[PDB]
Design a binder for this molecule. Structure first.
Ligand code: OSP
Ligand code: HG
Ligand code: ZN
Length: 257
Protein backbone atom coordinates (compact mmCIF):
# COMPACT_ATOMS: atom_id res chain seq x y z
CA UNK A 1 0.00 0.00 0.00
CA UNK A 2 0.81 3.70 -0.36
CA UNK A 3 3.63 5.29 1.60
CA UNK A 4 6.53 7.69 1.14
CA UNK A 5 9.24 5.26 0.09
CA UNK A 6 10.83 4.73 -3.32
CA UNK A 7 8.40 1.94 -4.23
CA UNK A 8 5.07 3.25 -2.87
CA UNK A 9 5.60 7.02 -2.64
CA UNK A 10 4.13 10.14 -4.40
CA UNK A 11 5.34 9.01 -7.86
CA UNK A 12 3.34 5.79 -7.51
CA UNK A 13 0.06 7.11 -6.05
CA UNK A 14 -1.53 7.87 -9.44
CA UNK A 15 -1.88 4.14 -10.27
CA UNK A 16 -4.38 3.51 -7.43
CA UNK A 17 -5.64 7.10 -7.21
CA UNK A 18 -5.84 8.55 -10.79
CA UNK A 19 -6.86 11.93 -9.31
CA UNK A 20 -3.16 12.32 -8.30
CA UNK A 21 -2.76 13.93 -11.74
CA UNK A 22 -5.99 15.99 -11.48
CA UNK A 23 -6.67 19.70 -11.96
CA UNK A 24 -6.60 20.85 -8.31
CA UNK A 25 -3.94 18.80 -6.51
CA UNK A 26 -2.06 19.79 -3.33
CA UNK A 27 0.37 20.87 -2.10
CA UNK A 28 1.61 23.70 -4.34
CA UNK A 29 4.41 26.22 -4.40
CA UNK A 30 3.18 29.61 -3.20
CA UNK A 31 4.73 32.18 -5.52
CA UNK A 32 4.35 35.29 -3.34
CA UNK A 33 4.82 37.68 -6.25
CA UNK A 34 2.15 35.88 -8.34
CA UNK A 35 -0.35 35.72 -5.44
CA UNK A 36 -2.92 38.55 -5.58
CA UNK A 37 -4.37 40.43 -2.60
CA UNK A 38 -8.13 39.78 -2.50
CA UNK A 39 -10.38 42.52 -1.06
CA UNK A 40 -13.52 40.29 -1.23
CA UNK A 41 -11.97 38.03 1.47
CA UNK A 42 -13.70 38.47 4.84
CA UNK A 43 -11.69 38.35 8.09
CA UNK A 44 -10.56 34.83 9.11
CA UNK A 45 -12.21 33.52 12.25
CA UNK A 46 -10.56 30.70 14.21
CA UNK A 47 -12.73 29.73 17.20
CA UNK A 48 -10.99 27.04 19.22
CA UNK A 49 -11.94 28.07 22.80
CA UNK A 50 -14.41 25.20 23.30
CA UNK A 51 -12.22 22.61 21.53
CA UNK A 52 -12.52 19.02 22.77
CA UNK A 53 -9.54 16.77 21.93
CA UNK A 54 -10.00 13.06 22.52
CA UNK A 55 -7.17 10.95 21.27
CA UNK A 56 -3.86 10.73 19.40
CA UNK A 57 -3.29 7.99 16.80
CA UNK A 58 -0.28 6.80 14.82
CA UNK A 59 -1.91 5.90 11.50
CA UNK A 60 1.26 4.62 9.81
CA UNK A 61 1.90 7.81 7.86
CA UNK A 62 1.60 10.54 10.48
CA UNK A 63 -0.14 11.02 13.82
CA UNK A 64 -3.62 12.52 14.17
CA UNK A 65 -4.82 14.44 17.20
CA UNK A 66 -8.58 13.84 17.02
CA UNK A 67 -11.36 16.10 18.32
CA UNK A 68 -15.04 15.72 19.19
CA UNK A 69 -16.84 17.18 16.17
CA UNK A 70 -20.44 16.33 17.19
CA UNK A 71 -21.18 20.03 17.96
CA UNK A 72 -19.77 23.43 16.90
CA UNK A 73 -16.97 23.57 19.52
CA UNK A 74 -13.89 24.43 17.45
CA UNK A 75 -14.74 26.09 14.15
CA UNK A 76 -13.14 27.91 11.24
CA UNK A 77 -15.10 30.55 9.33
CA UNK A 78 -14.62 33.75 7.32
CA UNK A 79 -11.78 34.30 4.86
CA UNK A 80 -12.59 32.46 1.62
CA UNK A 81 -15.10 30.21 3.42
CA UNK A 82 -18.89 30.27 3.24
CA UNK A 83 -20.51 28.76 6.33
CA UNK A 84 -18.94 26.82 9.20
CA UNK A 85 -16.17 24.25 9.16
CA UNK A 86 -15.62 22.05 12.23
CA UNK A 87 -12.21 20.90 13.44
CA UNK A 88 -11.95 17.10 13.27
CA UNK A 89 -8.19 16.48 13.63
CA UNK A 90 -4.71 17.91 13.23
CA UNK A 91 -1.45 16.35 12.11
CA UNK A 92 1.95 17.31 10.73
CA UNK A 93 4.26 16.48 7.85
CA UNK A 94 7.99 16.72 8.56
CA UNK A 95 11.42 15.88 7.17
CA UNK A 96 14.49 13.80 7.96
CA UNK A 97 16.41 17.10 7.98
CA UNK A 98 15.50 20.68 9.02
CA UNK A 99 15.84 21.87 5.39
CA UNK A 100 12.81 19.85 4.23
CA UNK A 101 9.49 18.59 5.56
CA UNK A 102 6.74 21.03 4.60
CA UNK A 103 4.31 20.18 1.82
CA UNK A 104 3.55 23.73 0.72
CA UNK A 105 6.58 25.77 -0.26
CA UNK A 106 6.96 29.55 -0.29
CA UNK A 107 8.92 30.82 -3.31
CA UNK A 108 10.32 27.24 -3.47
CA UNK A 109 11.43 27.44 0.20
CA UNK A 110 10.81 24.24 2.21
CA UNK A 111 10.16 24.51 5.96
CA UNK A 112 11.10 21.88 8.56
CA UNK A 113 7.48 20.80 9.02
CA UNK A 114 3.87 21.73 8.33
CA UNK A 115 0.84 21.52 10.62
CA UNK A 116 -2.58 20.75 9.10
CA UNK A 117 -5.72 21.56 11.11
CA UNK A 118 -8.44 19.72 9.25
CA UNK A 119 -12.04 21.06 9.15
CA UNK A 120 -15.28 19.83 7.48
CA UNK A 121 -18.21 21.86 6.15
CA UNK A 122 -21.09 21.43 8.61
CA UNK A 123 -23.84 21.61 5.79
CA UNK A 124 -22.64 18.13 4.76
CA UNK A 125 -23.41 16.44 8.09
CA UNK A 126 -20.17 14.48 8.52
CA UNK A 127 -16.56 14.23 7.32
CA UNK A 128 -17.29 11.22 5.06
CA UNK A 129 -19.92 13.16 3.09
CA UNK A 130 -17.87 16.42 3.03
CA UNK A 131 -15.02 14.65 1.20
CA UNK A 132 -17.44 13.96 -1.68
CA UNK A 133 -17.88 17.71 -2.18
CA UNK A 134 -15.80 20.39 -3.92
CA UNK A 135 -16.09 22.63 -0.80
CA UNK A 136 -16.28 19.87 1.79
CA UNK A 137 -13.06 20.61 3.65
CA UNK A 138 -10.93 23.47 4.87
CA UNK A 139 -7.37 22.80 5.99
CA UNK A 140 -5.47 25.51 7.88
CA UNK A 141 -1.78 25.00 7.17
CA UNK A 142 0.96 26.37 9.40
CA UNK A 143 4.67 26.18 8.66
CA UNK A 144 7.14 25.03 11.30
CA UNK A 145 10.70 26.30 11.43
CA UNK A 146 13.44 25.31 13.86
CA UNK A 147 14.38 27.81 16.54
CA UNK A 148 12.77 28.44 19.93
CA UNK A 149 10.52 25.77 21.47
CA UNK A 150 6.75 26.01 21.00
CA UNK A 151 5.33 25.55 24.53
CA UNK A 152 1.89 24.70 23.12
CA UNK A 153 3.41 21.76 21.23
CA UNK A 154 5.11 20.03 24.17
CA UNK A 155 2.08 18.03 25.35
CA UNK A 156 2.02 16.52 21.85
CA UNK A 157 5.77 15.85 21.86
CA UNK A 158 5.66 14.08 25.22
CA UNK A 159 2.97 11.56 24.30
CA UNK A 160 4.72 10.36 21.10
CA UNK A 161 6.56 7.71 23.14
CA UNK A 162 3.14 6.10 23.73
CA UNK A 163 2.22 5.85 20.03
CA UNK A 164 5.57 4.87 18.50
CA UNK A 165 4.21 2.41 15.94
CA UNK A 166 1.37 2.07 13.41
CA UNK A 167 -2.11 1.56 14.94
CA UNK A 168 -1.14 2.71 18.45
CA UNK A 169 -3.32 5.34 20.10
CA UNK A 170 -3.36 7.29 23.37
CA UNK A 171 -5.82 9.31 25.40
CA UNK A 172 -5.24 12.96 24.56
CA UNK A 173 -7.97 14.97 26.24
CA UNK A 174 -7.93 18.70 27.16
CA UNK A 175 -5.37 19.66 24.52
CA UNK A 176 -5.77 23.29 23.40
CA UNK A 177 -5.01 23.80 19.68
CA UNK A 178 -4.72 27.59 20.25
CA UNK A 179 -1.16 27.09 21.56
CA UNK A 180 -0.09 26.00 18.06
CA UNK A 181 -1.05 29.24 16.28
CA UNK A 182 1.29 32.06 15.23
CA UNK A 183 0.43 35.69 16.11
CA UNK A 184 -0.77 36.78 12.65
CA UNK A 185 -3.60 35.14 10.73
CA UNK A 186 -2.33 36.59 7.39
CA UNK A 187 -2.76 33.79 4.83
CA UNK A 188 -2.72 32.57 1.25
CA UNK A 189 -5.73 30.64 -0.09
CA UNK A 190 -6.38 28.36 -3.09
CA UNK A 191 -8.67 25.42 -4.04
CA UNK A 192 -6.95 22.05 -3.74
CA UNK A 193 -6.94 18.51 -2.46
CA UNK A 194 -6.01 16.12 0.32
CA UNK A 195 -2.20 15.71 0.16
CA UNK A 196 -2.40 11.96 0.91
CA UNK A 197 -4.43 9.27 -0.78
CA UNK A 198 -7.33 9.29 -1.58
CA UNK A 199 -6.17 12.79 -2.78
CA UNK A 200 -9.80 13.96 -3.10
CA UNK A 201 -10.18 17.46 -4.51
CA UNK A 202 -12.37 18.76 -1.67
CA UNK A 203 -10.14 21.28 0.18
CA UNK A 204 -10.08 25.04 0.54
CA UNK A 205 -6.47 25.54 1.61
CA UNK A 206 -5.71 28.37 3.99
CA UNK A 207 -1.95 28.61 4.53
CA UNK A 208 -0.70 31.08 7.12
CA UNK A 209 2.15 33.39 6.13
CA UNK A 210 3.70 33.46 9.62
CA UNK A 211 5.48 30.22 10.61
CA UNK A 212 5.71 28.93 14.16
CA UNK A 213 9.06 28.05 15.67
CA UNK A 214 9.72 24.66 17.28
CA UNK A 215 12.94 23.53 18.96
CA UNK A 216 15.43 21.09 17.51
CA UNK A 217 14.57 18.62 20.32
CA UNK A 218 10.82 18.87 19.60
CA UNK A 219 11.34 18.01 15.88
CA UNK A 220 13.84 15.30 16.84
CA UNK A 221 11.09 13.47 18.77
CA UNK A 222 8.79 13.59 15.68
CA UNK A 223 11.59 11.73 13.83
CA UNK A 224 11.66 8.89 16.42
CA UNK A 225 8.17 7.79 15.41
CA UNK A 226 7.74 4.64 13.27
CA UNK A 227 5.86 4.08 9.97
CA UNK A 228 5.77 0.34 10.76
CA UNK A 229 3.63 -1.54 13.25
CA UNK A 230 5.00 -3.04 16.48
CA UNK A 231 7.32 -6.05 16.02
CA UNK A 232 8.06 -5.18 12.39
CA UNK A 233 11.38 -3.87 11.02
CA UNK A 234 11.85 -0.23 12.08
CA UNK A 235 11.25 2.42 9.43
CA UNK A 236 11.62 5.91 10.92
CA UNK A 237 8.58 8.13 10.34
CA UNK A 238 10.32 10.93 8.40
CA UNK A 239 9.82 12.69 5.07
CA UNK A 240 6.05 12.06 5.13
CA UNK A 241 5.40 15.05 2.82
CA UNK A 242 4.15 15.15 -0.79
CA UNK A 243 6.11 17.54 -3.01
CA UNK A 244 4.57 20.57 -4.77
CA UNK A 245 2.14 19.80 -7.60
CA UNK A 246 1.29 21.77 -10.79
CA UNK A 247 -0.81 24.87 -10.12
CA UNK A 248 -2.65 24.44 -13.46
CA UNK A 249 -4.38 27.80 -13.97
CA UNK A 250 -5.55 28.22 -10.34
CA UNK A 251 -5.00 31.56 -8.63
CA UNK A 252 -3.58 31.80 -5.11
CA UNK A 253 -5.09 34.72 -3.22
CA UNK A 254 -3.52 36.69 -0.36
CA UNK A 255 -5.41 38.06 2.66
CA UNK A 256 -2.85 40.86 3.08
CA UNK A 257 -1.62 43.79 0.95
N1 OSP B 1 -2.78 16.18 4.51
S1 OSP B 1 -4.31 16.64 4.46
O1 OSP B 1 -4.65 17.02 3.12
O2 OSP B 1 -4.51 17.73 5.37
C1 OSP B 1 -5.22 15.37 4.89
C2 OSP B 1 -6.37 15.51 5.69
C3 OSP B 1 -7.13 14.40 6.06
C4 OSP B 1 -6.76 13.12 5.64
N2 OSP B 1 -7.50 11.96 5.98
C5 OSP B 1 -8.56 11.54 5.07
C6 OSP B 1 -8.56 10.02 5.11
C7 OSP B 1 -9.05 9.46 6.45
C8 OSP B 1 -8.46 10.19 7.67
S2 OSP B 1 -7.16 11.12 7.23
O3 OSP B 1 -6.65 11.92 8.32
O4 OSP B 1 -6.07 10.24 6.88
C9 OSP B 1 -5.62 12.96 4.85
C10 OSP B 1 -4.86 14.07 4.48
HG1 HG C 1 -14.40 16.56 -3.48
ZN1 ZN D 1 -1.68 16.92 5.98
Amino acid sequence: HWGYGKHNGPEHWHKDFPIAKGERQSPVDIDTHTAKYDPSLKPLSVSYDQATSLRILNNGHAFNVEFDDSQDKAVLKGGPLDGTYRLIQFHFHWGSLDGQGSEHTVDKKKYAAELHLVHWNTKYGDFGKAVQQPDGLAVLGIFLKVGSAKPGLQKVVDVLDSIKTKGKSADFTNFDPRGLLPESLDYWTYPGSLTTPPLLECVTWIVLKEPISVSSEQVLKFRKLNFNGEGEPEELMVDNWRPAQPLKNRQIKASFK
